[PDB]
Amino acid sequence: GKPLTEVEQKAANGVFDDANVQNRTLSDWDGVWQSVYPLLQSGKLDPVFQKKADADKTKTFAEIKDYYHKGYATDIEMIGIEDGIVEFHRNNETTSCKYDYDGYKILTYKSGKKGVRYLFECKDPESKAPKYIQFSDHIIAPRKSSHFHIFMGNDSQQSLLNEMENWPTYYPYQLSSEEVVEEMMSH
Ligand code: NI
């Protein structure tokens, strides 16, 4: 964690120019990562949603939680990334691929906020890993990720760009559940 520059902080809140977006390498996401979904399911994220619903007079607790329930849903409990390989862990079963970088795509949301998807492709015919994956983590140039959202599929990169409601979400495996909540409480 270098401190964020001025550009980097605005970019994290979805305000950036296209010309400042730069390519990134898979190693920005090296590490071992826990899905946050079990934390939602156990009620451990509720203080996140309590705070959010309190601050937002247009949304109820149930509106906030449901939106994140839909967003975080996945049975990939863990992801490991190392030496250009991403490993996916579902109930006792592991798949992995040496992913190739395919560039990024800039998306503009209805709010007018912006974000960048970083696209990779698995070209390994033996692999059972998703053929396409996209990383989104409020960062628009090389920098070690502190948490990320990942889109996974076997159909097309465009199909994943169209996705807006499910975005399995990963924080460092080493963080306690309390620390995830505190991170969520802020950023
Ligand atoms: Ni995020």
Curated annotation (Swiss-Prot):
Query: Has keyword Glycoprotein?
Result: no
Query: What is reported when this gene is inactivated?
Result: Mutant shows a growth defect and a lowered cellular Zn(2+) level under Zn(2+) limitation. Mutant does not bind cadmium.
Q: Which UniProt keywords apply?
A: Cadmium, Cytoplasm, Metal-binding, Nickel, Periplasm, Signal, Zinc
Superkingdom of origin organism: Bacteria
What Gene3D superfamilies does the record point to? 2.40.128.20
| Localization terms from the record | Cytoplasm; Periplasm
Entry keyword annotation includes Phosphoprotein: no
Conditions for induction? Repressed by Zur. Up-regulated in response to extreme Zn(2+) deprivation. Also induced by cadmium and hydrogen peroxide.
Q: Where does Zn(2+) 2 bind?
A: H147, E183, H187
* Molecular function, one GO term: cadmium ion binding
Q: Could you name the Gene Ontology cellular component terms for this entry?
A: cytosol; outer membrane-bounded periplasmic space
Provide the GO biological process annotations: cellular response to cadmium ion; cellular response to hydrogen peroxide; cellular response to zinc ion starvation; intracellular zinc ion homeostasis
Q: Which SUPFAM superfamilies match?
A: Lipocalins
- Which sites bind Zn(2+) 1? H138, H147, H149
Q: What NCBIfam families does its record include? A: PRK10306.1 (NF007639)
Q: Which family is annotated?
A: Belongs to the calycin superfamily. ZinT family.
Annotated protein name in UniProt: Metal-binding protein ZinT
This chain's source organism reads Escherichia coli (strain K12)
